[PDB]
Amino acid sequence: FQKVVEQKQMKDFMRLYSNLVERCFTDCVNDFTTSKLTNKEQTCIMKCSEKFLKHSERVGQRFQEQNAA
Amino acid sequence: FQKVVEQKQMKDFMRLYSNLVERCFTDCVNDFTTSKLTNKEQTCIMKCSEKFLKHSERVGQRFQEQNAA
Amino acid sequence: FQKVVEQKQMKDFMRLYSNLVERCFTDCVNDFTTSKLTNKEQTCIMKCSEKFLKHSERVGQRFQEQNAA
Amino acid sequence: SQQKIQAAEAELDLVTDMFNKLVNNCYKKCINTSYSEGELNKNESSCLDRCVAKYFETNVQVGENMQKM
Amino acid sequence: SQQKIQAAEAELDLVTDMFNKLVNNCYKKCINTSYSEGELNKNESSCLDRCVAKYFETNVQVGENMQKM
Amino acid sequence: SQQKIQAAEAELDLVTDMFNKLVNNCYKKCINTSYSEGELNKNESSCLDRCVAKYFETNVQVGENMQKM
């Protein structure tokens, strides 16, 4: 199909988002004395978000190059 | 669909059960000098089962509250 | 279905292969000063491949016995 | 649109997946099994509430981070 | 019933998933890769049998625990 | 063949799954989050390239190992 691709693409996007959320929650949120993110936890999530998306971008680029071969 | 929900619900149930089995096997069964669960391993699995289902229950409750918002 | 089985079987095979690749990459490839596997990394992957397939074979055998009961 | 309903499958897909990551994540953040008794104690109980809450706060946070870049 | 056959997809779904958890679980419980040689030794071999067995025993056990509550 | 196209679902299935293992694997091999800053540094960047490369080299390697036995 092609319709599968559009769906698979949607599922793929829902993937990153999810994995990203989980990645950054695991590395940044360690205090549960409250129900809200501190200042530090948001910054940490900011950096984690960036680092992960960048990393995820780079690997995607290499993945395409080596994929054509 | 609605039929998907009933199926998704079935898949969801098969999920917990599986994750529960894996959770408790990992934390309780560490002796393999025999092929049968000792007395202690069953109790451990009893407590693990309870703790996990409870935990899983609580999170589900919070998940519904924060989900409506 | 039966068609599902043939598909599920295909998905299953794609599973091992993938899990095997991941298993052996995680345990064997730890040097990234280059872009190619050293001599040692290939051997390690050779042994890992074997050990895993064997392990995977044995568990499959037991899985069938205990499954009939 | 028939395929549009695919959204239910897609959405309920991410809703189920997220809930599962939530369950597993918050277990690691809040549950101590060492010499524990099947009951979910008060401290574990509140940790969960706050954990589930920060997880959603993290979602939005990470959601706004992807929207920025 | 056409949708009833969905059971095959649902069942074979849990059968495949369980088998995979089994494979990964028992690997961690029984396999030592440190300075190991691609062959699956006797001790690793029996550990597997007993591991696969206790895993099923754990299934039923956990199954009876959910039936209680 | 309509079912033959299932190959696209099957292939793109393994392509997506592999890419995700790749992303997660190479993150663990190359990313250090300790006191890190959201930017992906040069050393992390090249590690990724070489990591992605050895991962494909590992695929083929593991592919030839299964072909042998």
Swiss-Prot record, chains A, B, C:
GO annotations of cellular component type: mitochondrial inner membrane; mitochondrial intermembrane space; mitochondrial intermembrane space protein transporter complex; mitochondrion; TIM22 mitochondrial import inner membrane insertion complex
The record's disulfide annotation reads C24-C48, C28-C44
Does Transport show up as a keyword for this record?
yes
Q: How does it sit in the membrane?
A: Peripheral membrane protein
**Keywords, comma-separated and alphabetical:** Acetylation, Chaperone, Disulfide bond, Membrane, Metal-binding, Mitochondrion, Mitochondrion inner membrane, Protein transport, Translocation, Transport, Zinc
| Broad class of where this protein is predominantly found | mitochondrion
Q: Where in the cell is it found?
A: Mitochondrion inner membrane; Mitochondrion intermembrane space
- Entry domain remark: The twin CX3C motif contains 4 conserved Cys residues that form 2 disulfide bonds in the mitochondrial intermembrane space. However, during the transit of TIM9 from cytoplasm into mitochondrion, the Cys residues probably coordinate zinc, thereby preventing folding and allowing its transfer across mitochondrial outer membrane.
Oligomeric state and partners?
A: Heterohexamer; composed of 3 copies of TIM9 and 3 copies of TIM10, named soluble 70 kDa complex. Associates with the TIM12 component of the TIM22 complex, whose core is composed of TIM18, TIM22 and TIM54. Interacts with the transmembrane regions of multi-pass transmembrane proteins in transit.
Instruction: Name the chain's protein.
Output: Mitochondrial import inner membrane translocase subunit TIM9
Question: Which species does this protein come from?
Answer: Saccharomyces cerevisiae (strain ATCC 204508 / S288c)
Swiss-Prot record, chains D, E, F:
**Chain location of the short sequence motif Twin CX3C motif per the record:** 26-51
Which family would the database say this protein is a member of? Belongs to the small Tim family.
Its domain comment says: The twin CX3C motif contains 4 conserved Cys residues that form 2 disulfide bonds in the mitochondrial intermembrane space. However, during the transit of TIM10 from cytoplasm into mitochondrion, the Cys residues probably coordinate zinc, thereby preventing folding and allowing its transfer across mitochondrial outer membrane.
Please give the subunit comment from the record. Heterohexamer; composed of 3 copies of TIM9 and 3 copies of TIM10, named soluble 70 kDa complex. Associates directly with the TIM12 component of the TIM22 complex, whose core is composed of TIM18, TIM22 and TIM54. Interacts with the transmembrane regions of multi-pass transmembrane proteins in transit.
Keyword vocabulary terms for this entry:
Chaperone, Disulfide bond, Membrane, Metal-binding, Mitochondrion, Mitochondrion inner membrane, Protein transport, Translocation, Transport, Zinc
Q: Which cysteines are joined by disulfide bonds?
A: C26-C51, C30-C47
GO BP terms: protein insertion into mitochondrial inner membrane
Q: Name one GO molecular function term.
A: protein transporter activity
Outcome, altering C30S: Loss of function due to severely affected folding and the presence of non-native disulfide bonds; loss of zinc-binding
Which GO cellular component does the record give, naming just one?
Answer: mitochondrial intermembrane space protein transporter complex
Establish whether keyword Ligase is in the entry: no
The protein in question is named: Mitochondrial import inner membrane translocase subunit TIM10
Tell me the stretch of the parent sequence this chain holds: 15 to 83 of 93
Q: Where in the cell is it found?
A: Mitochondrion inner membrane; Mitochondrion intermembrane space
Q: How does it sit in the membrane?
A: Peripheral membrane protein
Query: Changing C47S does what?
Result: Loss of function due to severely affected folding and the presence of non-native disulfide bonds; loss of zinc-binding
Cite the effect that the entry attributes to C26S.
Answer: Induces impairment in folding and loss of zinc-binding
Q: Give the protein's biological function.
A: Mitochondrial intermembrane chaperone that participates in the import and insertion of multi-pass transmembrane proteins into the mitochondrial inner membrane. Also required for the transfer of beta-barrel precursors from the TOM complex to the sorting and assembly machinery (SAM complex) of the outer membrane. Acts as a chaperone-like protein that protects the hydrophobic precursors from aggregation and guide them through the mitochondrial intermembrane space. Compared to TIM9, it may function as a substrate sensor.
Keyword set includes DNA-binding: no
Q: Which organism is it from?
A: Saccharomyces cerevisiae (strain ATCC 204508 / S288c) (Baker's yeast)
Q: Which gene encodes it?
A: TIM10
